[PDB]
Amino acid sequence: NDVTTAHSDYEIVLEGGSSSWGKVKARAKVNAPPASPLLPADCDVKLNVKPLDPAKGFVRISAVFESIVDSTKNKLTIEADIANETKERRISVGEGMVSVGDFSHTFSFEGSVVNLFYYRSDAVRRNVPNPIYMQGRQFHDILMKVPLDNNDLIDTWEGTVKAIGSTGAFNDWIRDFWFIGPAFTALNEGGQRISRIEVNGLNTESGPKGPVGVSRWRFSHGGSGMVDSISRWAELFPSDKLNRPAQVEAGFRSDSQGIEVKVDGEFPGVSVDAGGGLRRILNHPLIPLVHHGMVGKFNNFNVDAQLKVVLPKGYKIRYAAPQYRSQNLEEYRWSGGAYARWVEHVCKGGVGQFEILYAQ
Amino acid sequence: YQIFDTEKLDDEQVVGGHLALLGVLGFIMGIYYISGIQVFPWGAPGFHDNWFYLTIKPRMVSLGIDTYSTKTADLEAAGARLLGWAAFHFLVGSVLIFGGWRHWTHNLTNPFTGRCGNFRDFRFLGKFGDVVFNGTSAKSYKEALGPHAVYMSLLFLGWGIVMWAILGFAPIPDFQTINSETFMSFVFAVIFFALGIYWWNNPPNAAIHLNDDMKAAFSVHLTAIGYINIALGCIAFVAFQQPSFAPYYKELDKLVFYLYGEPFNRVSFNFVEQGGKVISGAKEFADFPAYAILPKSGEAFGMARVVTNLIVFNHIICGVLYVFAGVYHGGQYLLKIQLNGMYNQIKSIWITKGRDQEVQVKILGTVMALCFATMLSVYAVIVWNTICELNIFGTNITMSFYWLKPLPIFQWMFADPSINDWVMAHVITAGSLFSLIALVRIAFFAHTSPLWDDLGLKKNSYSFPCLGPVYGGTCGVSIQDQLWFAMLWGIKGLSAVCWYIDGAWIASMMYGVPAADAKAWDSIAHLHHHYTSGIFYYFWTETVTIFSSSHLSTILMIGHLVWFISFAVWFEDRGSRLEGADIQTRTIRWLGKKFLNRDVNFRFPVLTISDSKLAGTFLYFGGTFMLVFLFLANGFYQTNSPLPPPV
Amino acid sequence: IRRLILAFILPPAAVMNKEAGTIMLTGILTLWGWIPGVVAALIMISKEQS
Amino acid sequence: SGPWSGNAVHKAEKYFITSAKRDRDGKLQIELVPASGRRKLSPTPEMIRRLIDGEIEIYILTTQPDIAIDMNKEIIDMENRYVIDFDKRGVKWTMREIPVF
Amino acid sequence: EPVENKNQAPAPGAKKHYFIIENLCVGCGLCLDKCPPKVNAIGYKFYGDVQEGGFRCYIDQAACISCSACFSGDECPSGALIEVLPDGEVLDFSYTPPERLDFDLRFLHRFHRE
Ligand code: BCL
Ligand code: BCL
Ligand code: BCL
Ligand code: BCL
Ligand code: BCL
Ligand code: BCL
Ligand code: G2O
Ligand code: SF4
Ligand SMILES: [Ca+2]
């Protein structure tokens, strides 16, 4: 009875032609205990994208994370207006709210993110068809306004302004505060390092309700290539490929008994052009793998995995490493064997390739 | 012919298909059991003897389900026993087909509770899986090997219980009775239990399989089971001829077998089937009702060795075909992984060690050189023995290889060691080498051959009949074509097997011929057993009795028709047939329109070269071995009285 | 001394050092002309290594 | 082990000269692409070393936007046999689709 | 602790412009059969002495409809059947196997010595 097994069922239903729109249906469970020092940890995530204006590239993305962890009904909602300006700059108007137990507070931000690669050499991109590791830096300039409606909000504002005006290492220890718990151990495990922030301003002004605290700060996410927020900067924002609303409804309930994960999404960018007429199920982001490896190495598990890639009619998978167990004339199925070994590889922190090159 | 491909089916579908086929096979077994009922339980006369039941009557009487006793009494009891066991097989096969339908449709919902079990996760039989497996094979065939070993251990145990109680054969160590088969049934339980546990706790690894390998694992296990069949055929031949099996196989000769199609009591033309029917005409042999199938003694027919030969050759033909099919399906998998590029990514000796084309060429060259050497040696020996016995070029039998017995260290394998056994062994090695040329070509030269990598060509479609007349001709170069050539080459080793087991003198083509010294082999070689006539005269001697049977004659004609029909598709005629079929279509069109106003709009179909080769090899094998069945079903006809010198 | 005796019982085990083709040939030689022919094979190859 | 890496019909990996443009006037616009079709490379000196060593096999199609005839070094004493340099040799694949029905 | 959300995961169980290189075609015709019957862009051109390889394959680009049946079939044995992508790159196959640096792994003591 004391057997640790990781059951799973992934499904990728693609759309034909240039459309990269894919439907991801992932069920999973494992009787291994979670790594949360507070249990049980249950969470739901709703991530809905609507193209607000195709001409200006503005896409309204709404993210609602609800969670209960040791009986704490946390809930973070955020609605942003992400929009490219250049190939290396994005703007994001947005609003949002965060509620923990009884406490709650809103925010409204006007952020701007500039992702600059450390090199744009033509040799690398003309020699490597699949450039995974692209070192770079990502400068975030965030202007966030919070209405100070609660006693705790004003107390925190006072404490933070006192710390900035009195402590000379706030810009450096803010990372220690901010990457709570193992997060600081994660940025070092993914090749990331966050530079000292540049708090350009802390002010408070009258607003529609009362005193609103405005913070203008800057930081820089530094990726060594393994970071998907840098190497895949254009790949992770397919607004150009976004024609209809996209959805991602996920959730995980993780008690001492085990973890159960359910995900249902439909969104673009699942299939990217690999050249030679071969579309490819996109390169797997490496940050999820190397970050989940900080928890997946804690118990030996028997993998029971099944990946069902439902190709559009007419398309065939020419390469599959590991190879597809079965095929219902469009529904290629990976189950057991080298696929199970790869599922163990990536469930424990591996970043190995799983090539799926399909073409018509 | 590809509808049930491995890729098209998943593991549960295969489980269900095998289960439903086991049920169908149990129905077939019940049919054979009922066919074996010589006297019905109600008293009336029963079915005649069929080869389908004369093949299993030895085993059935071994288990006491059948009886060699000849009185109507206790033969009625044997018939009732056979009916009961056939009904058991029928019902269990119904249940097996139900399970097979459920697995094929994946509707594994209990009809009582409705709980839908999971093929991926399922406790076996309830608590036993918890005690032993602790949870199923989450995935993987490697984790399934141990569970299957435990299942086979339970099968062995169940057979032990059944024979101990139901069939009344207690477990006794002595290996001269069926009792040991009970004893060992328990032994092989523990073994196949313990090993299973081991393979459950310590799984084995051959990473080529386990991944996308229903075809790959199927190929390996089909080759393995083909060698299992060959070993079973050899074991059956040896054991069924041993004294311990004589009560069940040698006592066939004491019985008289009324077989369907055998000579029937003939009647004059002026015959009327009324009452006694004597006044109108005269039946051939009196005391038997007109048109009745006349008795045939097993002593003359040699039914002991006939049934032994039928079983042995069944297993040998099935095993050789399974080896060839396993190599072919493994070649299909090899070609698939070569096309998709996994070939170089396999990290196992079964693929890596032959990755180099140099080693493949050296392997096939060694096989070809050994085949040339052995074939040349055996054929020179045989043709020289024929030159001597026929006294051609002034020769005489004294110059033949009568001295070339198997060495004293190898005469244990052979009852009467002579040049016949030497030629048998070396012909078997040579035929194995010949078929291995094609099997190795499938194994290695599946996607590219050294000629083709030099010629700048690659084998992609695994069934393409050719690439055209380029380079003088590219006929029959797919792995499917090599499989067909392997089958047509193993035809000869399989023949040698048939002719050896049916008593032929394969060391010379003309043994027993009434010419020169052909009948002197028994004196010069000092043979004890009088071997059936030689390779060319064996046809004649066996057809003395094939021709005496209407049924065997019908088989002869039909198999010969089937065989020669194969050339219409195997010969380089496909284009001629296509042109002629266009002419046929036009002829039908205009002839019909003139003769009948209705238009045709139909074309005569012509097989593609791939389908042509498929059907041609099927017909070639079918005719050849439907006739080998006549060779093995005429009778052994090898007596233990050597023929004196011709002079 | 272990290699040669293992060879006289298991010649292909002795030629295991040699290429897979040689190992297969020695196995076939065990199958046909067991010991004398295959013992000849192993002694030839091992003495050649010397 | 060499026949099973890449296409089995090309012992030396083949590189078609797909695109070349006279506008840049340097002929660096020559853009070699392997038969696999995933690397739009350029005729660098390392590619020259590979070509002379025989590891690769540069080829030219006839049906295309003309690469460079007499503008990329050409030998016309016989039928044209284009060369990146006299020691190099770009064997032109011939493609007769227009001349024949 | 006990307060939770709820969820159920039933996992446990409990443009193209295809061409033919006349230099390399062997005239097998495995691509002709794939061409749609009415299109029939692919045709046979004969020089002489069929056994000497005179017969060859040609795609009439006017007749071709970029249906990809000829090339996607993976039927060309010689690699003559090529696809020129809209930007331009010659594809001799739907997917060529990756290039590898190979060596025979012979172990030291146990399995394949030397
Ligand atoms: C996570 C790794 C990086 C990071 C990388 C990025 C990337 C990449 C982007 C931003 C962008 C933004 N960043 Mg940031 N950023 C990080 C840390 C921060 C922190 C912080 C306190 O930690 C803050 C305040 C911000 C601030 C902001 C905003 C100003 C801005 C818009 C966010 C928005 O869309 O949110 C709404 C909230 C969500 C979308 C919630 C879910 C977030 C996850 C990561 C998205 C997963 C997508 C999923 C795999 C695919 C689902 C398909 C769905 C249909 C969408 N960043 C760290 C250091 N940041 C964006 C931009 O350029 O702004 C101009 C942008 O594209
Ligand atoms: C503010 C954050 C950024 C951003 C950050 C990232 C990052 C970082 C990554 C992506 C990735 C992807 N994003 Mg994004 N993404 C943004 C906006 C979008 C929009 C859009 C037009 O609004 C779309 C359609 C997408 C779509 C996509 C896909 C192309 C791609 C995942 C492919 C895959 O198969 O997913 C399969 C998806 C699933 C398996 C389901 C995953 C479900 C969960 C709920 C989403 C991740 C949540 C994360 C673990 C927790 C976030 C907590 C934060 C602290 C708030 N993103 C915003 C602007 N996106 C990834 C990718 O593959 O890059 C190449 C990647 O690395
Ligand atoms: C003949 C020489 C070889 C052989 C050569 C081939 C070739 C060549 C091919 C296969 C193919 C297949 N073979 Mg095979 N294979 C052999 C032995 C076997 C054995 C075995 C007995 O152990 C098995 C299980 C298989 C299994 C299989 C499948 C993996 C696959 C698809 C079969 C199916 O769907 O066909 C559907 C048709 C069948 C069910 C078989 C035909 C029999 C009919 C349906 C039986 C009932 C009617 C009646 C009794 C007999 C027929 C004649 C009557 C006049 C109607 N082969 C024999 C010994 N095999 C094909 C495949 O796709 O490969 C990838 C393929 O091309
Ligand atoms: C004895 C152990 C043998 C073996 C004996 C057989 C035989 C015998 C047959 C199969 C059949 C099949 N085998 Mg098997 N099989 C073995 C091991 C395997 C393994 C594995 C190791 O995991 C795999 C993946 C397979 C794969 C498969 C499938 C291709 C197929 C079952 C699907 C099904 O029934 O379709 C659904 C199809 C139906 C139920 C229709 C069946 C129609 C008729 C009644 C049978 C058709 C084939 C032919 C007449 C049988 C000829 C036997 C000859 C007399 C020698 N075999 C070993 C090697 N297997 C069957 C198949 O379909 O063959 C083509 C089949 O007959
Ligand atoms: C002859 C009957 C057939 C068959 C017909 C059925 C039928 C009918 C049903 C299933 C159901 C199930 N089958 Mg089944 N199935 C067969 C063999 C298999 C094999 C195998 C060992 O290779 C596998 C992997 C499975 C898989 C499964 C499970 C997913 C599921 C049971 C869940 C579990 O917890 O049940 C615990 C027990 C099991 C794992 C069953 C194992 C198979 C046994 C041998 C069935 C015997 C049935 C027979 C009438 C009773 C005779 C018992 C005597 C002791 C011999 N079956 C046998 C050989 N299978 C059942 C279901 O859905 O359960 C909820 C169900 O009702
Ligand atoms: C020995 C036990 C099994 C066996 C188990 C396996 C396994 C396991 C695999 C194969 C695989 C294959 N088998 Mg097999 N196979 C056997 C019998 C055969 C016979 C035959 C007529 O005897 C043939 C021709 C084949 C043919 C083939 C090919 C279709 C394929 C390998 C292709 C390749 O590249 O090989 C490259 C060439 C070689 C590796 C040559 C060297 C041989 C290896 C090292 C082992 C045997 C030699 C041994 C050391 C000899 C000396 C001692 C003696 C044992 C006394 N098998 C028997 C029945 N076979 C593979 C495949 O892909 O299946 C679909 C696979 O996974
Ligand atoms: C019984 C054996 C044979 C036939 C029966 C026959 C019949 C036949 N053949 Mg054949 N054939 C060989 C055997 C037989 N070929 C051999 C061993 C070779 C090796 C060289 C060979 C070779 C070629 C080439 C190269 C070409 C052809 C053709 C061509 C036909 C198309 C029209 C025609 O000829 O009608 C004239 C022929 C007849 C109509 C024959 C009359 C029927 C009969 C009395 C009884 C049929 C019995 C039956 C076959 C048994 C089972 C049936 C049922 C119970 C399941 C056509 C009907 C070609 C054409 O299409 O052009 C004309 C062509 O080009 N062949
Ligand atoms: S004779 Fe027939 S099989 Fe041979 S190459 Fe020509 S078309 Fe192909
Ligand atoms: Ca006989």
Numbering used by the authors:
A (entry chain V): 7 to 366
B (entry chain A): 62 to 708
C (entry chain F): 3 to 52
D (entry chain D): 20 to 120
E (entry chain B): 3 to 16, 130 to 229
Paper text:
Upon illumination, the excitation energy is sequentially transferred from the chlorosome BChls through a monolayered baseplate, Fenna-Matthews-Olson (FMO) complexes, and ultimately to a membrane-embedded RC, where charge separation occurs. Because only one gene encodes two copies of the GsbRC core proteins (PscA subunit), the GsbRC has a homodimeric architecture with a symmetric distribution of pigments, suggesting two identical branches of electron transport chains (ETC) that could be equally utilized. Two membrane-associated PscC subunits (cytochrome cz or cyt c551) contain the cytochrome c domain, which mediates electron transfer from the menaquinol/cytochrome c oxidoreductase to the P84026–29. On the cytoplasmic surface, PscB binds two FeS clusters (FA and FB), serving as terminal electron acceptors.
However, our RC-FMO2 structure reveals the association of two FMO trimers, two PscC subunits, two accessory membrane subunits, and additional pigment molecules. In the RC-FMO2 supercomplex, the orientation of the two FMO trimers does not follow the symmetry of the PscA dimer, and each associate with the RC through a unique binding interface. The residues that contact FMO2 are more distant than those contacting FMO1, and the effective areas that contact FMO2 are much smaller than those for FMO1, resulting in a larger solvent-excluded surface for FMO1 with the membrane RC (624.0 Å2) than that for FMO2 (247.1 Å2). A BChl pigment (BChl-A816) and a monogalactosyl diglyceride (MGDG) lipid are located between PscF and PscA1. Therefore, this identified BChl is very likely to serve as a linker bacteriochlorophyll to mediate exciton transfer from FMO1 to the RC. This linker BChl is not found at the FMO2 and PscA2 interface, and the spaces between PscA2, PscC, PscE, and FMO2 are filled with lipid molecules, leaving no space for additional BChls. The linker pigment was identified along the FMO1-PscA1 axis, but not the FMO2-PscA2 axis, and this could result in a higher energy transfer efficiency in the FMO1-PscA1 pathway than the FMO2-PscA2. Also, when the RC-FMO2 structure is compared to the RC-FMO1 or the previous cryo-EM structure, a loop of PscD (Q83-P108) exhibits a slight conformational change in the presence of the second FMO trimer. Compared to the RC-FMO1 structure presented here or the previous cryo-EM structure, the RC-FMO2 structure has revealed additional pigments: one BChl a (located at the interface between FMO1 and PscA1), one F39 (located near the PscA dimer interface), and one F26 (located in the PscA2).
